[PDB]
Point group: D3
Chain length 151, copies 6
């Protein structure tokens, strides 16, 4: 099911600690396709609508203030199982339950500063993709390698 | 039990995607000993006898055609627990159930293209070793490091 | 002087070979600040204008058509001497004159498939950046580690 | 709980196989703080008091002789959850039950030669810290990054 | 020109230090194509013939006996300028004149323990390859990414 | 000649950026032997004496105060030509004249924030080592792989 996409974001602490290329390179070596990319500082409202599903949690306002306080890098990747493989690569929410070899397990310590975001489902990936990206910032191309990665 | 050996093969998709040195280096850093090495294109019959145990599976013919369609790299490694440590290093059959830090978890997406093979048991390792290698292509040497890795 | 900017493009061949994060990581290690990023397929038009100042040369239309055959990743890095140093990280024009340790040194064979592009001077950086980026695609932020990197 | 510390030791086989920087770098990338460091050859008595809790095990004397036979490198690291994250990073006692991405899973084969030690609890970390280090060999400093790693 | 071939040998000291996959990876990154590989212990005879064109020199018998004290890994890589570029990846003869980024730059101290060997010219490559490999040990394949690497 | 020693210091800026293990790893790869290590904050006194032989220069007090603003990691490596080669791994004084592949090449921008320090000669090594280390802080050991590295 090769056309699946997920949205991955490096977060302000990930951008500040020099981790964007490291994380891009993990998904590249895996065989996934980068189809979208930008760096920007979310606004409060962007930070709020992105984490909309957790407005009741008492961490919410500290989260929205932190996410909107510097540049994040947004990406979209495409391939088979990219959403769930995305989350296996990122690691558990708390970097303390996160295994070595995962992004959060290798580079982060605190659940509040956990470097990177990844869609947790296909329907959520499709909603995060449409939030941050206009269709048309989404490059369509074909990897010279798809026959080495799929069939 | 230091004399155990396993057979590891990079497969056509692993060779094409430039992953042979990466995988050799993982077993090296671990402390294992490379005792055999070659690059060749299996034949249909080689591809069939190597995967002999699965002639009833409906993936078999696509597998045998894929395995025989380009060069693989065969290796044999020697050390304590090398067969089972080999399989922990390779990762689950499906690269989607495979953890980050494992060969299939780090570089592959599709079960059909999963970069590398490893004997799954000692008796199977001994049968794959004898299939691909003549005795005599098997170098005997002693690591200057065995006293740092064992005792 | 510390607000100097440079334009780095990963070429279509860099993107197709899975080099994007590797080049980003190297700029980040060296202490530079990423302020703008994107992926898109240059039209022939943008290839001609990006390379206007070389239209009279024989390779120019080969060059033109290649650069617009696939997505590229455009970047703008900030920091002190980032223009000379970007040139330095990328290595000579022609990978045959490129030292290992540089991106062309390590990754490239043909001058025609040399993976990446970097502004040759400050003037050229200013042109290529306004060329490829609108004012609102640029982030402005300050890196927490400015004091560890700049006297 | 940022002031937690743990004691990590590379062991004689880790020092001999050129693994100290690799292991220091793992804890660095994770966000932890190095607060203490030295290289020395334990004595028999140091080797015995360090592993005091296992004087009844029949491996004890081979262990104490091995630990005291060359230089180890001792370190103390500081951060939230550093003791338990330390042990997740090191891997299972036996390098054969240890996952890829962990120090013992990536570099070791034999339980008897397993490259590195890590405190297994806070009270044990505090006792190993006081055994090997005088207060005053413990540098107090503040990472320019604590606001990127915590809050 | 694109069918140029080179002979790379990892020396016994490269094999004993766990460098085999590191050197393979570097050739592969740079875009070269591996076509032949093996491990074996050179007899003194093969050491003399491999180095015939230097029998009159004082180091020659030191050289001869070392090169035949342990397994080596022989390779043949294909691509454009692969002979000059292999020399380039390996770095100067004497690691004291070798830049970091090169294999001797990064890994070697003594000219007598310089890890790896590479053909000095096309003539020499042709000789050393037919020297060390039979026609049937050579793979012939075409790399899926030929177009990303070669104009 | 094989007992030559050099003093490497990671500067406060190297420690604050998470470079300590990266620099240790590079010395270790190249085959050098670590014999002494520690972390501490130089007093202004020790900064003045470490750099006595440059008190007349204009940068000297900037230099003095920086070097004593934070912990540094001091090291002493042993091996053949380790003084010239340490200089070589670190790269030119001023990172603007430093090749990629070197520690300043890859990691540094300002001559004032150049990450690391290395003895410029054998005399200077002898001075800086007795300067920074007591006789009992030095380990003496022999590396199992001495024969793989030294003719
Ligand atoms: N207990 C908590 N304390 C502070 N911040 C939290 C907590 N749980 C979650 N967050 C912040 O909220 C983000 C979103 O949480 P959630 O969607 O449940 O996890 P995930 O990012 O792994 O899908 C986290 O990644 C973290 O930055
Ligand atoms: N469901 C499947 N679809 C396509 N190919 C498969 C499937 N299962 C296995 N194969 C191919 O068969 C190879 C051998 O399968 P098997 O021996 O069960 O796994 P393993 O290689 O992990 O021991 C796989 O590695 C894969 O290349
Ligand atoms: N002599 C040549 N033959 C073929 N292609 C060339 C030649 N010179 C340049 N090219 C191609 O066009 C680009 C020209 O830009 P140039 O000013 O020559 O240097 P740079 O890329 O180092 O800034 C290269 O990066 C390369 O892909
Ligand atoms: N079965 C065993 N055989 C030989 N040595 C062992 C064995 N179990 C433990 N040791 C040695 O003892 C050290 C301490 O054991 P223990 O404290 O239980 O494990 P850990 O180091 O993971 O906390 C081990 O790391 C290993 O070097
Ligand atoms: N002056 C010397 N002293 C000691 N050993 C040497 C000397 N020159 C060469 N050697 C050894 O013999 C080999 C000789 O081959 P050579 O033509 O000198 O260069 P290369 O290996 O760079 O092709 C080296 O790779 C090295 O191990
Ligand atoms: N011209 C200069 N301007 C500013 N700072 C300098 C200058 N020269 C040296 N420094 C600082 O002081 C140190 C001086 O030592 P030096 O003999 O110049 O070389 P090295 O560090 O390469 O041994 C440097 O490492 C650097 O941080």
């Amino acid at each position: 099911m090769s056309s699946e996409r997920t949205f991955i974001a490096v977060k302000p602490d990930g951008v500040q600690r020099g981790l964007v290329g490291e994380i891009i390179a993990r998904f590249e070596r895996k065989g996934y396709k980068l189809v979208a990319l930008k760096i920007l500082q979310p606004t409060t409202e962007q930070a709020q609508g992105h984490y909309k599903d957790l407005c009741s949690k008492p961490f919410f306002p500290a989260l929205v203030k932190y996410f909107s306080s510097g540049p994040i890098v947004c990406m979209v990747w495409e391939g088979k199982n990219v959403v769930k493989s995305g989350r296996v690569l990122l690691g558990a929410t708390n970097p303390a339950d996160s295994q070595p070899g995962t992004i959060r397990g290798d580079f982060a310590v605190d659940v509040g500063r956990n470097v990177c975001h990844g869609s947790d489902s296909v329907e959520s990936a499709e909603r995060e993709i449409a939030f941050w990206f206009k269709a048309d910032e989404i490059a369509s191309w074909t990897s010279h390698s798809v026959s080495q990665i799929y069939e």
